[PDB]
């Protein structure tokens, strides 16, 4: 019954869309389920985008309070994170691709948009917040997805985030846990101003029954790429930008010490994360040396 989610019920979706529960409670959507193929495609596109910001649109539906995402297609636009409502620049493409997809069994409607944040965490900036407000006003339901490919490679874990904004003029109650994230100095202001206007959904991933079989059979030639890959040589340029940013953060830390709340602890938290990633990059090489370069006669 795992593949039951893959069934698309047009009548049920039409009924749910007509009802519009979400217009009575601003905190409605709480879960975000993402397919395996969608996540792979998003990560691949974000990585292929290089150091620039690439954006795309993603298809799916809604089920109860959960936002289900099944596919994503990239958009031929450039210059995101600086222009409000960038997707409209390829709106005709939106018509061309989707109308093609409906011919080959892809029936799900457009559900959200995603973009990449290479090397400066997953969150929503001012431009992204404004674009999400516009999308929620004219394309409800909708969800914003932010991906970090460079940190995904560096930390060894998928760095993804699904956010939805609050309507203009609404006051959000409490909700101040503020899980720490390392933000560069040049972008530290944008995080501060727009931090209470959006809330993050709980992200989970799902895969079909055939995907599980193919993925367990694939872990027979793919174990080679794990212990035959070097992490130090791959993200060597990331932990130089990180050290530059840390050294500049220590400037403000010492300036405050000579007198924006306790910057030394935050600088220490950043230095600890960078050094931990660096040591993780060397532990794997030590293990590879112990396995492969120590079996002589």
């Amino acid at each position: 019954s795992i593949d039951e989610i893959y069934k698309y019920d047009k009548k049920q979706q039409q009924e749910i869309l007509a009802a519009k529960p979400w217009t009575k409670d601003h905190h409605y959507f709480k879960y975000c389920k993402i397919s395996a193929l969608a996540l792979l495609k998003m990560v691949m596109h974000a990585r292929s985008g290089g150091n620039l910001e690439v954006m795309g649109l993603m298809l799916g539906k809604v089920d109860g309070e959960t936002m289900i995402i099944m596919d994503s297609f990239a958009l031929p636009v450039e210059g995101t994170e600086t222009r409000v409502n960038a997707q409209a620049a390829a709106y005709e493409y939106m018509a061309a691709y989707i109308e093609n997809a409906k011919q080959v069994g892809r029936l799900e409607n457009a559900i959200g948009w995603y973009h990449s944040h290479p090397g400066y965490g997953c969150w929503l900036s001012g431009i992204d917040v404004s674009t999400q407000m516009l999308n929620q006003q004219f394309q409800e339901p909708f969800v914003a997805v932010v991906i970090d490919p460079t940190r995904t490679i560096s930390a060894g874990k998928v760095n993804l985030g699904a956010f939805r904004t609050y309507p203009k003029g609404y006051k959000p109650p409490d909700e101040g846990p503020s899980e720490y994230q390392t933000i560069p100095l040049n972008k530290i202001e944008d995080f501060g101003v727009h931090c209470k206007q959006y809330y993050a959904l709980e992200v989970s991933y799902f895969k079909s029954s055939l995907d599980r079989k193919l993925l367990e059979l694939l872990w027979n030639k793919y174990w080679v790429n794990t212990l035959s890959s070097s992490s130090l040589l791959t993200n060597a340029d990331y932990t130089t930008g990180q050290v530059f940013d840390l050294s500049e953060k220590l400037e403000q830390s010492e300036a405050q010490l000579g007198r924006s709340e306790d910057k030394l602890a935050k600088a220490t938290r950043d230095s600890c994360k960078t050094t931990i990633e660096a040591i993780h990059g060397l532990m794997s090489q030590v293990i590879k040396d112990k396995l492969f370069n120590q079996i002589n006669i």
Partner: peptide, 17 residues
Amino acid sequence: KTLHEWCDGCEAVLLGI
């Protein structure tokens, strides 16, 4: 003889991990 060494090395690495 030279495959036993490799097997023992892998086992000892796993134990250390």
